[PDB]
Design a protein around this ligand. Structure first.
Ligand SMILES: Nc1ncnc2c1ncn2[C@@H]1O[C@H](COP(=O)(O)OP(=O)(O)CP(=O)(O)O)[C@@H](O)[C@H]1O
Ligand SMILES: Nc1ncnc2c1ncn2[C@@H]1O[C@H](COP(=O)(O)OP(=O)(O)CP(=O)(O)O)[C@@H](O)[C@H]1O
Ligand SMILES: Nc1ncnc2c1ncn2[C@@H]1O[C@H](COP(=O)(O)OP(=O)(O)CP(=O)(O)O)[C@@H](O)[C@H]1O
Ligand SMILES: Nc1ncnc2c1ncn2[C@@H]1O[C@H](COP(=O)(O)OP(=O)(O)CP(=O)(O)O)[C@@H](O)[C@H]1O
Ligand SMILES: [Mg+2]
Ligand SMILES: [Mg+2]
Ligand SMILES: [Mg+2]
Ligand SMILES: [Mg+2]
Ligand SMILES: [Mg+2]
Ligand SMILES: [Mg+2]
Ligand SMILES: [Mg+2]
Ligand SMILES: [Mg+2]
Ligand SMILES: [Mg+2]
Ligand SMILES: [Mg+2]
Lengths: 288, 295, 294, 288
């Protein structure tokens, strides 16, 4: 489709507008379809957790004020608490930098049965990491050539994500594609609305100088890491209502692929359970 | 303070707390509606708590099997947004956990300031099944550890841990879901009979019933030993799901109300810099942005 | 007990000289005895690890260049790798500060059978934390009284260390008491010796302006947290050879009190193991080296 | 030597690697002394590695019970200072570890740059006992996971994980302590007969011997599938402890030599500030 990228070297960011709304032009229709999706997401979550077969990472990667937290909140607040974690990837700590860049990411992968939301991800290491060439200023072995760091990261990311797939963990990778002007509108709202002032930071503003280089880094990453098993989704982010609709559709269709079910217990277990049932009935004279 | 809130030591008589009390709200449909209103208020409080990053909250459920821990967590606390929430079931300790001290695994799960951690079971298991089955007698420990004071030292150390947490901006809500033995049996029958619930039944669920009375006494002992003003116990009648969900929603709302979270007010320095950012943004687009202020 | 403080409100730092050497006046004797102690520490560690009954924290708290790392290295390199962790407590990360201050410390406590060395400790929260009043700049609930933060930390620390003791974890708390001048000598060496340059920092120099306040904070902490179960050891730190001797003595004598032993198997296990012995011998037609030659 | 080092795929014949080869050093006392020389050098390199904070080292021992893992770790690596050292035994996975993917618990234990982590057993357990006992057939996983390719996918994913670590300044030394069944028996008899060693013996130690030949096959298969230039396997004869300790000391010291750690040299600006501090210190004590 128009938003799913599932092969390498097949992505042109200029062809993906930030304000496309072609799947559903009517805002109230989209709001309602979102609510239908959310109810199904809930139901699938309950089955996933009962079965304990397969985990799911829901990863959002986007510029500041593109919509990550608000999309996470509005679309996934319907989930029950059981088996859910949300992990924001912030500027790495000293300990995290002292380790390898996937250490903190792999640590947060969900168990089978569980859902982990990533607010940012391992892709920071080929986004800000690439744009600011952070590897040039970081401690590493003399034998690491700076000229292969980024290409090795794309290979290693491909390999890590495939390893996860092969071990019953799927990843949903969502790029919330916001325009520079819409970012500005949202920033002004963070400044002007006292309830939002806590969400604005110096680094939010400072990234704007590098806007075009970030766009290029996104394009490069999506070209390097989109596969059938681990696709990228490029979601127009200029309208929150439409972005929340599209994300709800991606999550529900991925859960449908996983097809979780309540487990069937073995015939032996069922016979033992029937024994316990009789004992319970006998204890209360069959008045239960 | 309340019929259900125990907030002083040595003040608890479990036989005076009926499993089927419903005195705060006798009408099921009233309670269902009020619970939904509570859940919205919990969400609103959570958003402020998360913004402020001042105080963390543990919501701990301790109860017998099929008392309603998971059901209550799901129906009431699905209100929360995902941000800043963890749910931690305490299961039979692993080798590594047993090789450590018993609070190690529990302290590791404590929330950050601004965050909420739900405990499905807790450190109290170490004075419930730990006491009932005298598990300390079969566990590795130093020769100098006096077996006769293990449990009393646990109540003291738990009091001190919870007070330490309170002194460091972490509150704990301790909820005992007080179910009857018969209602437990009814819920077990449903786990057996309903295919969608069969995964939730275990041999150990049935086998704990032999120790029912000993567990009741251990609960009473623990609540007598650890209820304080800062770290009270709530004894919630559990025989009606609708009522238990109402009461739990009320406890959570009222605790968040006491925490009184607010969206942070930024310093004068931040405000000055924000004015500069606003102007730069406006100038970049020739003042063609949505502003709530005049130009 | 000239160096051991084991009761509350019983410590006067001015009575503890940084250059006392009264337990062993002869350097070469002390060097030899330290080597003997190190071998004994290794032997005890092997028994401790086998038994899996009791854990040990060895915690060093001192100013920069007092000799924490060098003493850890020279004395505790005796240990086999199995069951050992060394945990330096640095400036807390965002995550650590978002948690409660004992979170990161409790996470690092050893398992039964194991030894964790703390280079700095939870006491930083009543040392630099008290000196610089760091609690005034940190996120916390409005109901927290800033004026009782430090006193509550001494009570909570006492309680945490007692809790550990009650759960089979001992703590050795060592204050390496160096003089301001000897610190200056050691700083000069870090500057002048190329292989040591990496160990010097601006913050090392800058702490010297707060020397007296740090001394007072150490005194306050030792007054507030010394007990029979969790004593403090105030070790003169102006001579490395003597400091290493004294530390080796404290560690040997603490392990001796723990009295670790290789475990004895149960009668049931012994019978099974005797059966396995027979099977092994029969498999090789008795051509195995047995200490019961038949 | 290239007699013990395997550094290419599909190049390994276990039957040609005898458990009692001693061809690098036939004289026990010469070997014991060379071991002590190596140990002094390992210590020196450890100090520099820790100062530099550029590269981490995993020293992984994978071997049957009583092959010599603990005793080799102890005798060869007790000379290490405690700073920057961890030892991690991989035991039977806990419920939480099984709920996660099999590399989660392994990757969590990887050392920081500057640090050394000893692995007693490793991620290779998942293609040793995991293969021998077909543990994946009894473990929760997604329905889409092909049981017939689980082990092959594990070799691929292990190759990719180890390469990823190498690309991120973490080396791994993989040591197979190749002990004979008879020598295992001799060592087990000692564990039974010496009361101080009884704690080291278990029913599972004795029970593994029924699968001896399947384990030998699994080792051969693993070493064929995972030996590379950057992440070689070392097949160390384990029937004589003195010789095994010598060879392990040689592998570790030569790997550290390759890492070539150095005490850092500070920048000219920092040096000038330090010279400022030196003067102030000298002035404070009147040049004493
Ligand atoms: N691997 C990595 N390397 C460098 N920066 C990273 C990173 N992973 C995330 N970050 C950065 O951390 C920031 C996290 O954004 P978030 O909105 O959570 O915090 P913030 O804006 O308050 C943090 P800051 O203090 O940097 O402004 C972003 O600037 C993001 O690019
Ligand atoms: N500190 C502790 N010591 C001993 N048992 C503990 C414990 N903490 C929790 N447990 C026990 O672990 C069990 C956890 O039950 P839970 O309902 O989560 O099922 P489970 O997933 O552990 C498998 P099962 O249904 O067979 O119990 C309870 O029996 C609880 O008492
Ligand atoms: N809880 C705490 N609160 C604040 N600061 C803390 C702390 N725990 C440790 N620290 C501080 O962190 C520093 C730890 O020193 P560290 O060993 O990281 O090196 P450093 O940055 O001083 C470089 P150098 O090797 O030159 O001394 C000390 O200044 C110590 O007081
Ligand atoms: N990934 C994994 N899957 C299954 N078993 C694993 C494993 N990793 C390690 N193990 C097993 O765990 C055991 C750990 O060996 P070790 O000799 O330390 O333990 P142990 O003998 O104390 C366990 P016990 O005494 O219960 O038999 C070995 O049998 C090893 O094969
Ligand atoms: Mg965000
Ligand atoms: Mg929710
Ligand atoms: Mg930012
Ligand atoms: Mg439950
Ligand atoms: Mg149970
Ligand atoms: Mg130090
Ligand atoms: Mg050592
Ligand atoms: Mg310092
Ligand atoms: Mg071993
Ligand atoms: Mg074994």
């Amino acid at each position: 489709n128009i938003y799913k990228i599932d092969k390498l070297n097949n992505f042109n960011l200029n062809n993906h507008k930030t304000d496309d709304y072609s799947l559903c032009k009517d805002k109230d229709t989209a709001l309602e379809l979102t609510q239908k999706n959310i109810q199904k997401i809930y139901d699938y979550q309950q089955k996933l957790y009962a079965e304990k077969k397969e985990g799911l990472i829901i990863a959002f990667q986007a510029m500041d004020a593109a919509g990550k937290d608000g999309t996470i909140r509005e679309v996934l607040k319907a989930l029950a608490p059981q088996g859910v974690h949300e992990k924001p990837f912030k500027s790495p700590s000293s300990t995290e930098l002292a380790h390898d860049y996937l250490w903190r990411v792999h640590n947060a992968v969900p168990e089978k049965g569980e859902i982990t939301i990533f607010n940012r991800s391992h892709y920071e290491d080929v986004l800000i990491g690439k744009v600011k060439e952070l590897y040039k200023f970081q401690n590493k072995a003399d034998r690491i050539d700076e000229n292969t760091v980024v290409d090795n990261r794309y290979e290693d990311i491909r390999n890590f994500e495939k390893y996860l797939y092969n071990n019953s963990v799927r990843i949903i990778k969502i790029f919330l594609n916001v325009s520079k002007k819409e970012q500005a509108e949202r920033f002004l709202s963070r400044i002007e609305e006292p309830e939002k002032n806590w969400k604005f930071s110096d680094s939010d503003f400072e990234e704007r100088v590098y806007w075009d280089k970030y766009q290029q880094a996104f394009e490069d990453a999506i070209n390097a890491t989109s596969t059938k098993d681990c696709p990228w989704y490029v979601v127009p982010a200029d309208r929150k209502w439409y972005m929340r609709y599209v994300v709800s559709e991606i999550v529900v269709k991925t859960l449908e692929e996983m097809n979780p079910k309540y487990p069937t217990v073995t015939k032996e277990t069922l016979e033992r359970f029937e024994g316990y049932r009789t004992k319970l009935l006998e204890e209360y004279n069959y008045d239960l």
